[PDB]
């Protein structure tokens, strides 16, 4: 994972330099190499039981995504966002498996950041994918909160729902906005339930 | 119940894989097998006096329902929601029988989640069924609260009424909305009564 | 009263099964048998000085009423609501006779529940009867509060007035709404008087 | 007074039964007999120095008035309200004579209840008479408060003024409403004066 | 003063009886006799240094004024209000002479009550006279407050200004309203000054 | 100063009697004699170092001004207001010379009272003169506050600015209103500065 | 500096007398002599290291400016305001050199007072110069606050920004208003930074 | 760095004098010399590991930028702002490298000040560059806050986001405004996460 991480970082540097200079071939090549290396690192994380590696792969994926938006190359941006959301899902899975809150919060932040990058570039499709992943992460976040105490997870989940709603508000995807509003309502109910259970 | 639970879980995995790959025959087959197994597990729960089994069958039913909405296959979604509401009713029954609050709260959450899935898919019929079941659960929730103390049940019941109202607001079923508003009023009254009684 | 109560309960079960299956003859027959048995039980309560029997007869009557609304058979629903309001009046009478607050609160809740069932079915006539009975119960509630202390009865009475007003608001019976608003005003005055007297 | 009270109560029972059955001759006869007996009891109260008798005569008069409104027989209702207001005036007189607060508060409540009965039946004339009597009672209430301490009388007086205003608001007698608003202003001033004096 | 007071009281009783029966000659005769006797009593108060006599003469004058409004005889009502305001001025004078707060507050209340009686009868002329006298009393009230401590006089003065403003608001005399608003502003300033001085 | 004060007071009594009777020659004569005597008394105050004499001369001038407004004789009212404002300026001067807060507050009140008298009579010219003098007094008030502590002077100055603004609001002199608003802003700044300095 | 200060004061007295009498030649002559003497005194202050002399020269300049506005002679008013702003700049310089807060606050007040005088006379040009100098003083005020503690400087700076904004609001120079609003925003940020740093 | 700093300061003095006198050749020459010297000083800072040198170079760059806006020479202003933003980026880099909060806050303030200078001059291009750099600094600020404690960094980051939004509001660059609003939402989420993590 260490050599993998360093190679992925150097490829990200290549991609940033190619974006500043204005390359495409090296741009997409280093980008997809970084995503392949990040997926390989995610594989290594589960084969060797390391959660932090998943988070770092997510961060690497996020960096690649941000670069695409500055660059604007959508063809690679979509692949990067798909990778980032998949890594977020894997993070949720391993966190619910182990019972570690911080991983869930990082998953929620990764989902929301993919959403924000979409909102910046203006890609309604990946925006919907991101919002769906974020609401799913809110689900799993409330569930973990119920499982392992940590009341602040409840507040974080409600706030993530509100954030998804407001982001859909600015962008305009009323479908996503309706999903988010209904989810905030039902999550307020579940929140009162879990708070009473634990506290 | 254990082997039953594992078989139902594996059938749910089959259904999820069939939904991602895009199957229908295996999709509906594994789905209805999961519902049949969940109903069998509900039977086993009462024949062997286990409440938690009812909750797990509800969760399994809920998972199947969510999948239908992602999939969109309404013909199975309606059966799944009917099963989920019936399991919620059984949960209310056994909870009022024993005097266990947590079961009632889980029933309310199951009803509201069926409602939210309906709101997502946009099926006004099952939405009305879900809202009615939820208000009934609020009734039984206030009743138990009066029976076994636990004041937080009162707040949960009022909040469930408010949630049903707001969900009907977003969807638009003004009939359900009127039922919910009137129910919130009369429940505020009953709430002041029960709070004075217990506290 | 015990055998009477069990027979009334079994008749209620008959009525529920007939409503689910879709009967009318057995429906109305078991319903009117339940009401006759509940009135007989009310008789037994006074002849043997038992208040709780009155409350249980009220509950049985309420159950029959709810069933009519799900069923929609108005011809029996009106008789059931008339019975329920009469039982509420008897409850008020015996409570003011003995000086027991809880009975008065249960009377208020029974009146409001008859009102809510009317609002559900949409029968303005019985709605007016229910609202009148509820305001009368608020009168007697303030009176008892003055008699036997228990300040919370004051808050309950004001809240019942507000609830009658809001229910008339949703339904639309402006006459009942005006009665309720005027009654809330004069009850706020009486409330300040009684609070100063006792506290 | 005791035999007088019992005879008046039995006549009230006659009147209630005649109202339920639908009589007029016995209705008005028992009603006017009850009012005559209540006035006789008021006479007995002053000739034998008993304040509580005045309050009970007021209550009896109030009961007769309520019955008229349910019945709707205005020709007797006006006489009943005139009697009730006169008894309220006598109560104010004897209370200011002795220096007993509770009697004044009961007078205010009697006046407001006559007003509310008028508002129910819709008789603007007696409504104006009632509002005038109520404002007069507020005057005497502030005066007693200044005389015998008891600060809560001040709050009760201001609240009675506000109640008269709101009742005139619902009914519509803008003249009475203007009287009440001006009276509330000047009573707020007098209230600050009396509070500073006593406290 | 004692025999004078009793004769004035008996003349007031004559006037009340004449108003109920509907007299004019005896009405005006007893009224002007009462006012003459009250002025004689005011004379006696200063010749024998008794402040309370002034207050009682004011009360007697106020009673006569109220009666005129119920009666509506304006020709005597104007004389009564002129007398009452003059007695209020004399009360202010003697209070500032001696340094007794309660007398000033009673003067303010007398002025406001004359104003309220005018507002009832609807005589804009005497209304303006009353408002002017009330603002003058507020002036002298702040002055005394500065002289003899007693901070509550400050709050009473500001409240009297606000009351004059609101009364002019309901009646409509915009000139008086403007005077009152400007006076409230300058009195808030003087109030902050006096509060800082004393406290 | 004593004989001067008594002669000025007697001349003021002459003027009041002449105003009630309706004189002009004696009215203006006693008025201008009172103003001449008050100016002579102001001279005596500085020649013999007595501040209170200045305040009493101001009060005498204020009394003359009030009388003009009741009378309405503008030709003398303008001279009286000019005298009063000049006395206020002299009061500010001697107060800043000695360092005595109360004198400054009395100056502010005198200026505002001249303003209020103008607002009553409706003389926009002297109103502007009064507002200018009042804002100047607010300046000197903040300055003294900075000099001799006494934080309440700060609040008094801000309140005087607000009062000048509101008075200009009612009257309508938008120029004066703009001056006052700007002055309130800059005085809030100076107030935060002085509060931090002292406290 | 002492003889210089006295000569400048006497020239200011000459200018005030010439303004009251209505002179121009002596008016402008004494004015420009006062400004020349104040600049000479500013020179003396730095050559002999005395900050208070700068403040007194500023005050003298401010007095001359005020006089111009009462007089209205713009040709000298502009020179006076230019001098006052330059003295304010010098005050800021020497204060930041030494590290003395009070001098900075006095600079801000001088700038705002020049602004207020401009707003009075209505000279948009010098108004813009004053607002710019005031915002510059706010900059240096935050900087000193960061340098020498004294948190109240932060609040004073924010308040000066708000005051500049409101003054531009009343006058109408939307450009200055936009500068001030943006400056208030960025100063709120810098304020949170400095508060966290020090406190 | 010391001689470099002094030479850069003297060149800044040359530029200020040339701006007041109205030069262009010396203006741009001293300006670009100052920027070259500041970049050389930034080089020296990293080659000799001194963070404060970076901040001083930023301050020097900021001073040059301000001067351009007063001067209005855009051709040099753009280069100055580019330099300032690059220095801000370098400051963020070295701060995240070492783990020193104050440097990050200074970077945010530098970015916002470049933005404010742009808003003053009205150059939408550099305004967008500045807003982007500021949001990037907010990102790195939250990241450091998570890294090295110091909760106040969280509040500073949220406030910087709000400030960028409001600045875009006044100027009008709705694109930048949308970026800022979305960033504030996602930063509120990240803020709740980091606060829960640390505190």
Coordinates of N, CA and C in Angstrom, one line a residue, chain F residues 25-163:
Chain F
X25 N -51.9 93.8 27.0 CA -50.9 94.8 27.4 C -50.2 94.3 28.7
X26 N -51.0 94.0 29.7 CA -50.4 93.5 30.9 C -49.7 92.1 30.7
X27 N -50.3 91.3 29.8 CA -49.7 90.1 29.4 C -48.2 90.2 28.9
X28 N -48.1 91.0 27.8 CA -46.7 91.2 27.3 C -45.8 91.9 28.2
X29 N -46.4 92.9 29.0 CA -45.6 93.7 29.9 C -45.0 92.8 31.0
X30 N -45.8 92.1 31.7 CA -45.3 91.2 32.7 C -44.4 90.1 32.1
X31 N -44.7 89.7 30.9 CA -43.8 88.6 30.3 C -42.4 89.2 30.1
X32 N -42.3 90.3 29.4 CA -41.0 90.9 29.1 C -40.3 91.3 30.4
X33 N -41.1 91.8 31.4 CA -40.5 92.1 32.7 C -39.9 90.8 33.3
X34 N -40.6 89.7 33.2 CA -40.1 88.4 33.7 C -38.8 88.0 33.0
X35 N -38.8 88.2 31.7 CA -37.6 87.8 30.9 C -36.4 88.7 31.2
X36 N -36.7 90.0 31.4 CA -35.6 90.9 31.8 C -35.1 90.6 33.1
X37 N -36.0 90.2 34.1 CA -35.5 89.9 35.4 C -34.8 88.6 35.4
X38 N -35.2 87.6 34.6 CA -34.5 86.3 34.5 C -33.1 86.5 33.9
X39 N -33.0 87.4 32.9 CA -31.6 87.7 32.4 C -30.8 88.4 33.4
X40 N -31.3 89.3 34.2 CA -30.6 90.0 35.3 C -30.2 88.9 36.3
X41 N -31.0 87.9 36.5 CA -30.7 86.9 37.5 C -29.6 86.0 37.0
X42 N -29.6 85.7 35.7 CA -28.5 85.0 35.1 C -27.2 85.8 35.2
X43 N -27.2 87.1 35.0 CA -26.1 88.0 35.2 C -25.6 87.8 36.7
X44 N -26.5 87.9 37.6 CA -26.1 87.8 39.0 C -25.5 86.5 39.4
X45 N -26.0 85.4 38.7 CA -25.5 84.1 38.9 C -24.0 84.0 38.6
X46 N -23.6 84.5 37.4 CA -22.2 84.4 37.1 C -21.4 85.4 37.9
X47 N -21.9 86.6 38.2 CA -21.1 87.6 39.0 C -20.9 87.1 40.4
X48 N -21.8 86.2 40.9 CA -21.6 85.6 42.2 C -21.5 84.1 42.2
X49 N -21.1 83.5 41.1 CA -20.8 82.1 41.0 C -21.8 81.1 41.6
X50 N -23.1 81.3 41.1 CA -24.1 80.4 41.6 C -24.8 79.7 40.4
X51 N -24.6 78.4 40.2 CA -25.2 77.7 39.1 C -26.7 77.5 39.2
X52 N -27.2 77.2 40.4 CA -28.6 76.9 40.6 C -29.5 78.1 40.2
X53 N -29.0 79.3 40.3 CA -29.7 80.5 39.9 C -30.0 80.4 38.4
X54 N -29.0 79.9 37.6 CA -29.2 79.8 36.2 C -30.3 78.8 35.9
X55 N -30.3 77.7 36.6 CA -31.4 76.7 36.4 C -32.8 77.3 36.7
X56 N -32.8 78.1 37.8 CA -34.1 78.7 38.2 C -34.6 79.7 37.1
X57 N -33.6 80.5 36.6 CA -34.0 81.5 35.6 C -34.5 80.7 34.3
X58 N -33.9 79.6 34.0 CA -34.3 78.8 32.9 C -35.8 78.3 33.1
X59 N -36.0 77.8 34.4 CA -37.4 77.4 34.7 C -38.4 78.5 34.6
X60 N -38.0 79.7 35.0 CA -38.9 80.8 34.9 C -39.2 81.1 33.5
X61 N -38.2 81.1 32.6 CA -38.3 81.3 31.2 C -39.2 80.3 30.6
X62 N -39.0 79.0 31.0 CA -39.8 77.9 30.5 C -41.3 78.1 30.8
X63 N -41.6 78.6 32.0 CA -42.9 78.8 32.5 C -43.6 79.9 31.6
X64 N -42.8 81.0 31.3 CA -43.3 82.0 30.4 C -43.6 81.5 29.0
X65 N -42.7 80.7 28.5 CA -42.9 80.1 27.2 C -44.2 79.2 27.2
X66 N -44.4 78.4 28.2 CA -45.5 77.6 28.2 C -46.8 78.4 28.1
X67 N -46.8 79.5 28.9 CA -47.9 80.4 28.9 C -48.2 81.0 27.6
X68 N -47.2 81.3 26.8 CA -47.4 81.9 25.5 C -48.1 80.9 24.7
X69 N -47.7 79.6 24.7 CA -48.4 78.6 23.9 C -49.8 78.5 24.3
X70 N -50.1 78.5 25.6 CA -51.5 78.4 25.9 C -52.2 79.6 25.4
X71 N -51.6 80.7 25.6 CA -52.1 82.0 25.1 C -52.0 82.1 23.6
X72 N -50.9 81.6 23.0 CA -50.7 81.7 21.6 C -50.1 82.9 21.1
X73 N -49.7 83.9 21.9 CA -49.1 85.1 21.5 C -47.6 84.8 21.1
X74 N -47.5 84.7 19.7 CA -46.2 84.3 19.2 C -45.1 85.3 19.4
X75 N -45.5 86.6 19.3 CA -44.5 87.7 19.3 C -43.7 87.7 20.6
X76 N -44.3 87.2 21.7 CA -43.6 87.1 23.0 C -43.0 85.7 23.1
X77 N -43.6 84.7 22.5 CA -43.2 83.3 22.6 C -41.8 83.2 22.0
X78 N -41.5 83.8 20.8 CA -40.2 83.7 20.2 C -39.2 84.3 21.1
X79 N -39.4 85.5 21.7 CA -38.4 86.1 22.6 C -38.2 85.2 23.8
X80 N -39.2 84.6 24.3 CA -39.1 83.7 25.4 C -38.2 82.5 25.1
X81 N -38.5 81.9 23.9 CA -37.7 80.7 23.5 C -36.2 81.1 23.3
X82 N -36.0 82.3 22.6 CA -34.7 82.7 22.4 C -33.9 82.9 23.8
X83 N -34.6 83.5 24.7 CA -34.0 83.6 26.1 C -33.7 82.2 26.7
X84 N -34.7 81.3 26.6 CA -34.5 80.0 27.2 C -33.3 79.3 26.6
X85 N -33.2 79.3 25.2 CA -32.1 78.7 24.6 C -30.7 79.3 25.0
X86 N -30.7 80.7 25.1 CA -29.5 81.3 25.5 C -29.1 80.9 26.9
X87 N -30.1 80.8 27.8 CA -29.8 80.4 29.2 C -29.3 78.9 29.2
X88 N -29.9 78.1 28.3 CA -29.4 76.7 28.2 C -27.9 76.8 27.8
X89 N -27.5 77.6 26.8 CA -26.2 77.7 26.4 C -25.3 78.1 27.5
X90 N -25.7 79.1 28.3 CA -24.9 79.6 29.4 C -24.8 78.5 30.4
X91 N -25.8 77.7 30.6 CA -25.8 76.6 31.6 C -24.7 75.5 31.1
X92 N -24.7 75.2 29.8 CA -23.7 74.3 29.3 C -22.3 74.9 29.5
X93 N -22.1 76.2 29.3 CA -20.8 76.8 29.4 C -20.3 76.7 30.9
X94 N -21.2 77.1 31.8 CA -20.8 77.1 33.2 C -20.6 75.6 33.7
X95 N -21.4 74.7 33.2 CA -21.2 73.3 33.6 C -19.9 72.7 33.1
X96 N -19.6 72.9 31.8 CA -18.3 72.5 31.3 C -17.1 73.2 32.0
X97 N -17.4 74.4 32.4 CA -16.4 75.1 33.2 C -16.1 74.5 34.5
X98 N -17.1 74.1 35.3 CA -17.0 73.6 36.6 C -16.8 72.1 36.6
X99 N -17.5 71.4 35.7 CA -17.5 69.9 35.7 C -18.6 69.4 36.6
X100 N -19.9 69.8 36.3 CA -21.0 69.3 37.1 C -22.0 68.7 36.1
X101 N -22.3 67.4 36.2 CA -23.2 66.8 35.2 C -24.6 67.2 35.2
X102 N -25.2 67.3 36.4 CA -26.6 67.6 36.5 C -27.0 68.9 35.7
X103 N -26.1 69.9 35.7 CA -26.4 71.1 35.0 C -26.6 70.8 33.5
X104 N -25.7 69.9 32.9 CA -25.8 69.6 31.5 C -27.1 68.9 31.2
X105 N -27.5 67.9 32.0 CA -28.8 67.3 31.8 C -29.9 68.2 31.9
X106 N -29.9 69.2 32.8 CA -31.0 70.2 32.9 C -31.0 71.1 31.6
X107 N -29.8 71.3 31.1 CA -29.7 72.1 29.8 C -30.4 71.3 28.7
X108 N -30.1 70.0 28.6 CA -30.7 69.2 27.6 C -32.2 69.2 27.7
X109 N -32.7 69.1 28.9 CA -34.1 69.0 29.2 C -34.8 70.4 28.8
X110 N -34.1 71.5 29.1 CA -34.6 72.8 28.8 C -34.7 72.9 27.2
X111 N -33.7 72.5 26.5 CA -33.7 72.6 25.1 C -34.8 71.8 24.5
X112 N -35.0 70.5 25.0 CA -36.0 69.7 24.5 C -37.4 70.3 24.8
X113 N -37.5 70.9 26.0 CA -38.8 71.5 26.3 C -39.2 72.7 25.5
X114 N -38.2 73.5 25.1 CA -38.5 74.6 24.2 C -38.9 73.9 22.8
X115 N -38.2 72.9 22.4 CA -38.6 72.2 21.2 C -40.1 71.7 21.3
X116 N -40.4 71.1 22.4 CA -41.8 70.6 22.5 C -42.8 71.7 22.5
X117 N -42.5 72.8 23.2 CA -43.4 73.9 23.1 C -43.6 74.4 21.7
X118 N -42.5 74.5 20.9 CA -42.6 74.9 19.5 C -43.5 73.9 18.8
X119 N -43.3 72.6 19.0 CA -44.1 71.6 18.3 C -45.5 71.7 18.6
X120 N -45.8 72.1 19.9 CA -47.2 72.4 20.3 C -47.8 73.6 19.5
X121 N -47.1 74.7 19.6 CA -47.6 75.9 18.9 C -47.4 75.8 17.4
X122 N -46.5 75.1 16.9 CA -46.3 74.9 15.4 C -45.5 76.1 14.9
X123 N -44.3 76.3 15.3 CA -43.4 77.4 14.8 C -42.1 76.7 14.4
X124 N -42.0 76.4 13.1 CA -40.9 75.6 12.6 C -39.6 76.3 12.8
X125 N -39.6 77.6 12.7 CA -38.3 78.3 12.9 C -37.7 78.1 14.3
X126 N -38.4 78.4 15.3 CA -37.9 78.2 16.7 C -37.7 76.7 16.9
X127 N -38.4 75.8 16.2 CA -38.2 74.4 16.3 C -36.8 74.0 15.9
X128 N -36.4 74.6 14.7 CA -35.1 74.3 14.2 C -34.0 74.9 15.2
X129 N -34.2 76.1 15.7 CA -33.3 76.6 16.7 C -33.2 75.7 17.9
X130 N -34.3 75.2 18.4 CA -34.3 74.3 19.5 C -33.6 73.0 19.2
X131 N -33.8 72.4 18.1 CA -33.2 71.2 17.8 C -31.7 71.3 17.6
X132 N -31.3 72.4 17.0 CA -29.8 72.7 16.9 C -29.2 72.9 18.3
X133 N -29.8 73.6 19.2 CA -29.3 73.8 20.5 C -29.3 72.4 21.2
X134 N -30.3 71.6 21.0 CA -30.3 70.3 21.7 C -29.2 69.4 21.2
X135 N -28.9 69.4 19.9 CA -27.8 68.6 19.4 C -26.4 69.1 20.0
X136 N -26.3 70.5 20.0 CA -25.1 71.0 20.6 C -25.0 70.6 22.1
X137 N -26.1 70.6 22.8 CA -26.0 70.1 24.2 C -25.6 68.7 24.3
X138 N -26.1 67.9 23.3 CA -25.7 66.5 23.3 C -24.2 66.3 23.1
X139 N -23.6 67.2 22.2 CA -22.2 67.2 22.0 C -21.5 67.5 23.3
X140 N -21.8 68.6 24.0 CA -21.2 69.0 25.2 C -21.4 67.9 26.3
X141 N -22.6 67.2 26.2 CA -22.9 66.2 27.2 C -21.9 65.0 27.1
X142 N -21.7 64.5 25.9 CA -20.7 63.5 25.7 C -19.3 64.0 26.1
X143 N -19.0 65.2 25.8 CA -17.7 65.7 26.2 C -17.6 65.7 27.7
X144 N -18.6 66.2 28.4 CA -18.4 66.1 29.9 C -18.3 64.7 30.4
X145 N -19.2 63.9 29.9 CA -19.1 62.5 30.3 C -17.7 61.9 30.2
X146 N -17.1 62.2 29.0 CA -15.7 61.8 28.9 C -14.8 62.4 30.0
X147 N -15.2 63.7 30.4 CA -14.3 64.4 31.3 C -14.4 63.9 32.7
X148 N -15.7 63.7 33.2 CA -15.9 63.6 34.6 C -16.6 62.3 34.9
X149 N -16.3 61.3 34.1 CA -16.9 60.0 34.4 C -18.4 60.0 34.1
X150 N -19.2 59.5 35.1 CA -20.6 59.5 35.0 C -21.1 58.9 33.7
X151 N -21.0 57.5 33.6 CA -21.4 56.9 32.3 C -22.9 57.2 31.9
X152 N -23.8 57.4 32.8 CA -25.2 57.6 32.4 C -25.3 58.9 31.5
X153 N -24.4 59.8 31.5 CA -24.5 60.9 30.6 C -24.4 60.4 29.2
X154 N -23.7 59.3 28.9 CA -23.6 58.8 27.6 C -25.0 58.4 27.1
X155 N -25.7 57.6 27.9 CA -27.0 57.1 27.6 C -28.0 58.3 27.4
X156 N -27.8 59.3 28.3 CA -28.7 60.4 28.2 C -28.5 61.2 26.8
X157 N -27.2 61.3 26.4 CA -26.9 62.0 25.2 C -27.5 61.2 24.0
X158 N -27.3 59.9 23.9 CA -27.9 59.1 22.8 C -29.4 59.3 22.8
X159 N -30.0 59.2 24.0 CA -31.5 59.3 24.1 C -31.9 60.7 23.6
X160 N -31.2 61.7 24.0 CA -31.6 63.1 23.5 C -31.5 63.2 22.0
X161 N -30.5 62.5 21.4 CA -30.4 62.5 19.9 C -31.6 61.8 19.4
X162 N -32.0 60.6 19.9 CA -33.1 59.9 19.4 C -34.4 60.7 19.6
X163 N -34.5 61.5 20.7 CA -35.7 62.3 20.9 C -35.8 63.4 19.9

